[PDB]
Structure formats: structure tokens, C-alpha cells
Symmetry: C4
Subunit: 390 residues, 4 copies
């Protein structure tokens, strides 16, 4: 909460140097009134390494290499050493790609940093171009504006051609910044293409898998009604949970977090068991992790009155109805929370009523063999179960 201000200030002073140094390098008339803010900015920059404490850009930028050759006059070719502290931008970018890189998309952050670098380099190239120019009597503002317009035209690969170089040195400068502008335009194109490509992931993956399964059944000469049912089920899955499988997403979590997730999910179902009031937490903790989720569409047969039957079902989201053997006299209707199929684990007996799903159910299924496997090691719970069984 107290270092964010420092990081913002160091970014601001680096950006101010980037704007200022070439502008006062081309113009000797400047830097006369800009003494105190520059002095305090230089103090802020040199007061960076002790707070930070690889180190090379910081070492090469922290020393007051400026403020001497602005009045200590030297020829132009050796005067280019005033841009050594411009390497502060690299450290600023390396710090910004770690302090806030997770709030936004890293590709977006890289693109924004590249755009800022483009603007700074365009300003620097415009300053250099207007420096490397025959002298004339004209206002400074128009002279800088023309240079900026020309460097924007060159860097964007548009090439209006209204103004063209004349002397060979201008032509060489144009060639080198033409290669530079082409390279940076390529970088921007690549960044935008990558960001666009890595934008739609789930909506394309679900479409690809539904297309694959639709083509596969279309080969198998399947009936159109079943095709419509499967397409509707996939559309429902995409609309509900964005086409993510249950057990394929509840696997990255470790054991305790998965157990906590299951407990929070079934905290409204575990205490509504008529055959077990909750006399024991270890048994509930063991049985809660072995629930197998299944999805039943509208009109699907969950349990048929007449089959053997060995599985119990816990209703989680949808609503289900219970019908008779002849499917003409409805017995009862169930909803979320309350479960059914309890007369399948206490003895090996056939089912009694046919259960038909009205809408999408999102119910969880517990089998028989795993239940027996994880109940056989608890004798007290077993006694409490077969005392109520008969």
C-alpha cells in the first residue's frame, strides 16, 4: 500500500525522461528553466537502488550522467551518451510484468507495453529526424509536428510521400527507421493475432466436440430423433456449466479442497437421510467422495419398476417424478435435496416404482459395490443399518 506510490513515481520519472531528453537534446534553448524538477527527479532515480536492495540497467541509469553535458558543451557525435538512462524502461517493464500481470491478460499487458514503447520510440525518432535537418526559420511547434507526422507515416507502413529525404544521411536514417518500423509493425500484428486467437476457447472447444460427435453418429446411420436429443443435451450443458465435465474439473484440486467442496455441496442433503440421522462423521466423509454424477434428459428412464436395481440416487438440481408400474397412477413428485431409491442397499430386492425424469435432473448416483466396500470396515454403522433394515 506504500510501495505502489513509489512504483508509480518511478514509472512517471522514467516516462518524463523519455519525453524530455531527446527534446532538450535537439533544442539547446531548453533546460534553462527546468532545473529543480529535473534535480528532484534525478534524486528520486538515484534513490532507487538502496530501496530495491540484473542490476546493470539500474547501475547505468542511476548515476547523474546528465546535468553535466547540457552546459558543458561537447560535439554532437559524442553527445548521444545522454540516453543511457533510457534503459530504465526495460526495468520498468520487468517490474510491471510482475506487480500487476495477473489482474489482466498477460498478452494484453504485453500489447499495451509495446504500444507505449511505440509512442516513445516515435517521439524519439521524430526528434532525431528534426535534429538531422537543414536549418531554417520556422516555429519549433510546426517543425516538431511535421517530424512526428512523418515518423508516424513511416512507422505505420503507409508512406504518403509528401515529404522525402534529400541528403544521403537523411536517406540512411529513413532506411534504418524503415526497417525498425516494419519490425515493430510485425510485432504489433503478431501480438494482436495471438490475443485474438487465445480469446475464444470454451465456445470453440465445445463446438468442436459437438461437431465431432454429431459427425460420428451421422456416420453410424443413427435416428434423427436421438441426434436432436443429444444436440439439445449438449446445448443445455453449454448453457448451464459452459460445457465442462464434472469429474474432469474436480480433479485439479487436492484431496482436502475436494473434500471441502463435496461437503459444501451436500451440506443440504447429508442431514436429510431418514435411514441415518447422522450418528457418525467418518462414514459420511467416506461416502460423500464416492458419489458419481450423471445427467438425465427429459423423458429418460432412471429406474424401471421390474428391474433388479442396486443404486441409490441423490437429487441435486433438477426435479423428478415417480410413476407406478403401469405409468398411469402417479405416486409422488420430488425436487432438489430430497433423494429416492433407498430400498436398494439394505437388501437385494427388485424395484417397486418406475421413476421418470421431467426436466434435466443433475442428480448424483451411488452404486452398491463401493457402498458395501466402504461400509464393511465400519461395524457399528453396519449394525445401525441392518437394525433399521428389518
Amino acid at each position: 500500500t506504500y510501495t505502489l506510490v513509489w512504483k508509480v513515481w518511478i514509472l512517471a520519472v522514467t516516462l518524463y525522461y523519455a519525453i524530455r531528453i531527446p527534446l532538450t537534446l535537439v533544442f539547446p534553448s531548453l533546460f534553462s528553466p527546468l532545473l529543480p524538477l529535473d534535480i528532484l527527479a534525478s534524486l528520486a532515480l538515484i534513490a532507487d537502488i538502496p530501496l530495491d536492495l540484473s542490476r546493470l540497467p539500474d547501475l547505468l541509469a542511476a548515476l547523474p550522467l546528465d546535468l553535466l553535458v547540457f552546459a558543458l558543451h561537447l560535439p554532437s557525435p559524442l553527445s548521444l551518451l545522454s540516453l543511457v538512462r533510457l534503459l530504465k524502461l526495460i526495468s520498468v517493464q520487468r517490474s510491471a510484468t510482475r506487480i500487476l500481470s495477473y489482474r489482466i491478460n498477460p498478452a494484453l499487458l504485453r500489447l499495451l507495453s509495446l504500444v507505449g514503447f511505440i509512442l516513445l520510440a516515435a517521439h524519439g525518432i521524430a526528434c532525431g529526424w528534426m535534429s538531422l535537418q537543414p536549418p531554417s526559420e520556422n516555429p519549433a511547434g510546426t517543425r516538431y509536428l511535421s517530424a512526428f507526422y512523418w515518423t508516424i507515416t513511416t512507422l505505420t507502413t503507409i508512406g504518403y510521400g509528401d515529404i522525402t529525404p534529400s541528403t544521403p544521411t537523411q536517406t540512411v536514417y529513413t532506411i534504418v527507421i524503415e526497417l525498425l518500423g516494419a519490425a515493430m509493425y510485425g510485432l504489433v500484428i503478431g501480438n494482436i493475432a495471438s490475443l485474438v486467437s487465445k480469446l475464444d476457447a470454451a465456445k470453440l472447444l465445445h463446438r468442436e466436440r459437438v461437431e465431432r460427435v454429431t459427425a460420428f453418429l451421422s456416420y453410424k446411420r443413427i435416428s434423427p430423433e436421438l441426434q436432436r436429443r443429444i444436440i439439445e443435451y449438449f446445448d443445455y450443458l453449454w448453457e448451464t456449466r459452459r460445457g465442462y465435465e464434472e469429474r474432469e474439473v474436480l480433479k485439479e484440486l487436492p484431496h482436502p479442497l475436494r473434500l471441502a467442496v463435496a461437503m459444501e455441496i451436500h451440506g443440504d442433503v447429508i442431514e436429510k437421510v431418514p435411514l441415518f440421522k447422522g450418528a457418525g462423521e467418518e462414514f459420511i466423509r467416506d461416502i460423500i467422495l464416492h458419489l458419481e454424477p450423471v445427467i438425465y434428459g427429459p423423458g429418460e428412464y432412471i429406474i424401471r419398476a421390474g428391474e433388479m436395481g442396486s443404486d441409490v440416487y441423490f437429487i441435486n438440481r433438477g426435479s423428478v417424478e415417480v410413476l407406478s408400474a403401469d405409468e398411469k397412477t402417479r405416486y409422488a413428485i420430488l425436487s432438489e435435496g430430497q433423494f429416492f431409491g433407498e430400498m436398494a442397499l439394505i437388501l437385494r430386492a427388485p424395484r417397486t416404482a418406475t421413476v421418470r425424469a421431467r426436466a434435466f435432473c443433475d442428480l448424483y448416483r451411488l452404486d452398491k459395490e463401493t457402498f458395501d466396500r466402504i461400509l464393511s470396515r465400519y461395524p457399528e454403522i453396519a449394525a445401525q443399518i441392518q437394525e433399521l433394515a428389518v
Copy 2:
């Protein structure tokens, strides 16, 4: 069926505003005859929020901010507030990316929306450029056509340079729209690249996997004839089912849909069992989900007369022949639907005839151990089986 007309009308009125508002902003001579259609369009726009009932663009666009400053004359710099309702395009795009985004490729929809935005922005920029221009005596049509040609030339990064800015404000406008045009050209390039990259998926994945396996066997000093056989098998798989594995595509479906798919597939094979007429549906439902699909090429040995043999085979698509032990006297020829290998489950006896595949078979195999496991729990079916066994 009654809201699609409303959505089309709101898209039409938004597009009409986008075309109209800058054109009548630059031209004070217009808007004189265009009273009633504008009034009804404004009523249609303001009658959007009650039908809809985040809300910010709708609130900022629904109010009749226009129709007052068209005759209530104000200076140009503050007159730009007539484009507030142009934010309706964002809501239109957000509604279109949900009402019909699944009929076509989402990347294609995004590209088309971007192209429409490009055209609208080009028209707006042309109107602004012809507004920011020294006055002259010329027809309005040619003056607008020149501006549109110039903004198309700038936005496409071509830069003919026949017409160039003169005043500094024209140069600043050119610079800002040059950055804008470069950005949107980058967006279009990225969208096209992503759409092209995400076009060929199966034809490239199958090619990659066949190249991988071909290189792997080429390392292992494998015989060329087996290489040709495997290449032909992979080509057949790609031609038939687009190179999709059976069990790797019949796994996204849940249990009931998979059971229905299996039932629909084997609805012509389950009733053609000579050893079981169908006295029981639970047994058929249990055995239908455990069938293991295999593919046999031309000339492959399915069953050899002399081996032990424990598996039964159901023919699904291809045709197979039955040969004798000496492979000189053909016994019978089989086709789809009818199965063989039934004298392998009722007792532990060696095979009798050698079965050779003529063409690609696409037959399904059922093993012995799983069959015994899922038959041991049905005593009546077991009695009905070993009564016919001997």
C-alpha cells in the same frame, strides 16, 4: 418469432443513426425534410428499455438528446455530444453475439461485426475530414466521395498520397486516424489469421498422428509391407469416420444417452441370437454396453482353427468369410448383422473353423471374463444358457 423483428428493427435504426448523424452534423442544409422518420425512430429507440426490462449505454442512448441541437444552434466544439447514442452499436453487438452466435462460427461473426464497424468508422471519419476542410464551391457528392476515398486509402495502409493535409489541424487529424487505421488493420489481420488457423483441425490432427506413427515404425526397422498395410488402414479410417476413435468419442455422452446409442446401434443384432430369443431385457441391457469394437483389415486372421478361443464377435458393417482348418474348403460366408463365434462361451472348447476377413469388418468383440462376470448375477439366464449348451 415475434422478437426477431424487433431486434432487426433496432439494428436497422442504430445503423441508420450511424449513417445519418455525422452526415447531417457536417451538413446544416439537411434534416429539414427528415422529421417524421427520425421522430418515429427516436420513439422506437426510447421504447427499448421497457421491453428489455449493463444499462448504461441504453440509458445514454435512449433519451432524445438529438432533435434539439439541430435547430437550437450552438458552436461546433460542444456540438460533438450528438454522437452519444452511437454507443447503441455496442449493445447491438452484445445482443447479436448471443441471439445467433451458434448458427455460424463465432470467429466469423466477430470478423463480420468488425468489418461493419470498419465501414461505419470509415464513413464517420470521412464526414469529419470533409467537415475539417477549407470552404470551397464544389458539389457535395464529389466532396464526400473524395473524403471517403482518402479515408479508405489511409485506413488500408496504402497511402497513394495524391491529396495531403496542409494545415496543422489536418495533420493532427491524419496522425490520429493513422494510428486508428493501423490498429484496426491489425485487428482484421489477427481475426483472419485466427479464423484460418482454426479451420482445418481433423485433417491436420490425423495427418500429424499418422506421420508420428510412420516415423516411429521407420525408426524400428519395420518391414515396408506392414508400413503399407498400416498406411492403408489409416487412410480407410480417415475416409470412413474422419479418423475418430470409437471409445474416445463415445465417452462425452452420459450413461443414458450412451445406452440409447448402443441400443439403436444393436437394434438389428440383439434379436438375431439363436441361443437366446430375448427372454429378458436386463441381460441384454447389461451385455450391450460391454462390447469392445475392433477393426480388422483385409486378409487378417480373426480366429484360427486350432487356437483356444474365448471371445464372440458381432459383425456390424463389413463382410467376413469362414474357412476350414486347411483353408481350402470354404464353409460359409457372412455379412453384417449375423454374428459368429458362439461356440466359445457355453463351454471351454477349442475353435473349429478358421475365420478370415475379406474387407474391412468394423466388427465388435465380446470377451469371456466380463460375460461371465455380468452373467453370474443372473441365475435364470444362466440356467437358460446351460440348458441349451448341452
Copy 3:
């Protein structure tokens, strides 16, 4: 072998129409000597549908819509209907993306087709531009060359600007072909980007996985020597089999092809068993599919004299040495083909000699429990084994 000539001829006649029709549309002086070749080409085109026998481009292109309005003079605006047969290119591309799409990369084929379409469209646009031009006394060759140069300059987004439109219709044509050229340049950029991205797959996947594992061990404070050993092993794997796992590539094949591959691999090892001369093919066929491949680096301990030991090893590629318990008196040296570790399955006895690997071995391991499981069902082979055991 007889339809390839027909496909080449239909491609040639379509390309000839594409070159010819606009050129003789702009030039009324042509088509005078080009009667017979055009007549036979039209006969070849109209003789396409009976050989082929969706059908719409073929129907719209097969009829002799040309050869009437070349001398049956009509005004220019309605004369554009002579390009209806240019839709033959779509059918040609759809046929070419199936007749030879698997010899080369599909992305490369799409790029080449797009380049051909670019050239044809550039020629057509040049013809249209030189048609829409004020009349002048100049040679036809130079007039066509200037138009082609201009349309290449426009389509490549270069924009020299030496020649510019003057009349409004020329400006409209320039605008529409500018949008067209931008769109096709975007398509070419996207195709090239996709082809480059989908070029290096294995060399990048292996690099990514080795970087992942190197970083993971670098976190775990692992010794540098083990890091060097693992890096060398990964480099050896990439150099040898392009970084493809054995069991992860021998799984796409079905059961019979995998069995044939295993038989061809071990056709030099299965007959060199001193404890079993080969009295039975079913046992060999059963044991050949359960071999587990492992890789041992230089200096790794395969078997230590003193451990319990339950696995047998078959040498496939590398060479291994056998040392004594004290690792000072070498017993024997082995190479590919010949196996060792046979005194581990016939009784539960401890190992006798320490086996150390010299170079990379690529040997296959067979365990004890699976061997017993697949031998217990063969009593004769069991008797033949324990008769030689003692």
C-alpha cells in the same frame, strides 16, 4: 490413370477462360482468329456433366453463354454476363482439394490456390481498369502493362501513387478494389501465419516438456549431476525416436496391427529362448503383447546381485554387460537379440550376478505376476516349464 488427364484438361480450359474472357471483353478487335480452339474448349466444358454423373456452378458454366455476344453486339452494362462460367474455378478448387490434397500439406495447397486466385483476380482487375479509362492513342501492350502494374501496386498495399484516378467512377473502382486487395492481403497473411505456426510441432513439444521437467526439478533442489543425466537422456530420446513415447504411440493401432508389429519386432528374439524351443504359438502370442519397454542410461543398475528379483529382460537395441557381486570380475558381455535374467520365473530365488548397462539399452521387461497369470491357463506349457526348471 485415365481421369487425371481429364482433370488437367478441365483445369487448363478453366484457366484459359479466366485469362481470355476479360481480355477479349475489353478488346473488341480480338476473338476474330480464336474461333476453333474456343469451340473445342466449349465442347470440352459442356462434355463435363455427363462424365461427372452442388451442380449449380456446373450448370451455370456448361452452357455456351459465350460465342453469341461477341458478334451479337449489346451495350457494355449488360455485357458483364460473359463471366458466369468463371465460377468453374470454385468447382476446380473443390475437386483439387480432394484429388491430391493428401500428397502435400492442406495449408500449403490452400495457400497455392489462393495465390493462383490472386493472380487471376489481378489480371481481371487490370483488364477492368484499362477498360474504364479515357480513350487514347497508345499501344495495347503498354496500356495493359500499366494497368497490371497499378493493380499489383494497389493489391499489395504499397501505393506508389505515380498514377491516380481522376474521374469519380475511377475513384469508386479504386475504393472497391482497395477493400478487395486489403481483404486478400489479410487472407494471405493469415494463411502464411497458420502454415508457419503449424510447421514445428515435435521439436517444440519436446522442448516444452523438457523445460517443464527441468524447472520442476530445479524447484526441488535436485543435484546438478542428476539434472545433467536427465538432460542427456532427453537429448538421446529426441535424437533417436524424436521424443515419442513407446506405449503412447503404440495405442492408435488396433489389436491385430499391434500384434503384427510386436511379432515383426520380436521375430529375432522369440526363437532364441533356451528354456523353450517354441512348442506352441498361442503362448508366444500371449506373452509378446505384455512386454513393458524401459530405457536404461549409461551406468544404471538393472539387476543387483543380492536383491530378490522377479523380472526377465529382453535386449532389443543396446548392449549390456554382466558383472559379479563384487564388480571386479566380469562374467560375460551381451548384445541385442540375446536376453538375460531367465533365472527369475521358474522359482522364487535371489539374483546371482549384478547387471550394469554400458550404453543406452532400449531393453524390454517382462514381470512375474502377469507371466504367471497368462501361463496358469496353459497347463502343457506349465509342465514343459517346470520339467526344465529342475
Copy 4:
């Protein structure tokens, strides 16, 4: 160490030929003083095939096809055969993509090679353009600089248009190099886009999976506190091990390397067992590979005093505390290396103390059933265990 100099020399001589041959082809005044270095370079090139010993570029480049037609004067159209040895660049690239392709990213190497080819082709095209030019009295340096500037302007799709072709042959040359420049700019764009897209992999994959799981729990109406806990756990995993699962990264290694990794990891834990001083290496080697890693967050319940308990835990990185049943009297605090939970394998007894994690633990868990399975086959270790059990 002695062939790298030779490869550098062959690259240098090929690059020197690439720079030199067109420059002395356009200028007949050159090549007069450049006899001896050219002679030794030709000897070095012709002395390449014997050291190397497909061969076609080497054969076509090794022979001294130059040095004859530089003074043996022939007309220009047939003089283009002096560029046959320029195919040496293809062999140089093919050698460079194998000698050092693994030190850097292969995409980066391809991009750098393409950039070098761009520079060489630009120089060659500039030489050709200044050759195909009307004669004039001007310095050679300015004449070459203008040509280089023009070819850079053309190849970068900028098109200043200050200088334009006049004769038809210049226009044809401009057209062909315009297509060439567009193609190579597309190649550069594609390479940059691929390199950018294949740059951020782990930081994007972890973000995608955490977004997927966050959305999935957001659907399930999960409590915000558990969401915060899971988000913090995922952030910790990314900060610590870059979001790589343990068992999903310790699977590419084969059996011996994995065993060595486990031994090096537990070389500080295996010798700190109070119940077993280390009387046997086979038992330790067997039990070390079956450890199951788990991650426990701050405040998670590892062991509760009152549960049954069957697993032992080895602390690896984090620190854990031990509390009493009532969680008011702390018993002891543990750290890395030292383990706990030992009173769970020697008999079936309930736990005694509740263990709560303070910070992230990174501890490893060993279960009961696998321990019994891999201990039952060692009778001496079993006797040594149950002698200390009681």
C-alpha cells in the same frame, strides 16, 4: 572444437560471395584488385565436399564457375550464371538448423535466418535495379544508395513513390519484386506471430484452468470463503512450482530415473525412521516409489483425534503443528524432514492427537493397503516391524 571454426569460415565465405558477386557483376571496374582473397575463398569452397564426405547444391557451388567470366567477356543475358554458387546459403541454413538449433528457440533461429536472407536479397535486388538503369554521370556510392533505399521502400510495403519506373522493363522488374516483397513480408509477419503465440504457455494454461474451475464453482453456488481459499491455493501453486502437478510431471521419466529422483528427494527422510534404522535396502526402494503427494492449505485438518486413521505422513517442505483432542494444549511442533502419524500401520488403532497445518505443507502420504501389499512379501522386515510394534 575444431569444426566450429570451419563452419564459421564457410558461413563467412558464403556471405562474402552473396555481398560481392552482384556488386562486381554490375560493376566491371571491380574485381581487379580482389584476386588473392577470392582465390583462397574459392579454394576453401572447393575443399568442402571432401571434408563433408543432398549433394546437389554443394556440387553446383563447389566448382570454380566464377573467375572465368569476369575477364572472359560475354553478353549480359547469359552472364547471370555467376549466381549458381549462391545456393550455398541453403546448405548453410540446413547445417545451422542442426549444429546450434537447440541453444535457442527454433522459431527465433528461423526468424533470424529469414532476416539475413531478407538483407541479402535486398542487396541483390538493389544491385539488379541499379544495373537495369539508363547510364548517367554520378558517383557509384549515391547510385547504390538510391537503389538500396528504393528496394527497402518496396520490400517493406511503404511505397514513398519519390522515384518511379519509366521504361517497361523497369516496370516489370518492379512488379516481380513487388510480389516478392509482399511474399517475404508475409513470411516475416507469420514468423513473428508464431513466435509471439508460442511464448506464454504456462502462465496462460494456469490462468485458463483456474478460470475454468472458478466458473464451475461459481455455477455450483459455492461459498465465497472457499472460493478465496481455492484461489489462494492456486496462486501459491503457481508462485511455487509454476502450476505443474507432481504426478503429471514425474511420468515422462522412465523407471530408473524416477527411482533416482525419489531417492535423491528422500535421502534426508529415509534415514530418520525411529521404527526402522534401515536394515534392508530393497524394502526402502519398494516403499519410496509409492508415496502419494498431497498439498494442505493453512488451517486444514490433516488428522483429527477421534477418527480411525490408517495413513502415515512424511513432511517434506512445510511446517505443521500437533494439537490435542480439545485443541487447547499444544503437544509439539514439527518441521521438514521429521515425519508423524507412525502409530497407524503397526496395529489397527484410532488416532490420538489432532494435527493441524499452519502454512502450506507439501507433505507426502503413504496409505495402509499398499504398505501391507508391499510388506507381505518381505517376512524378515515384517518380523522386525511387529517385534517393535509390541
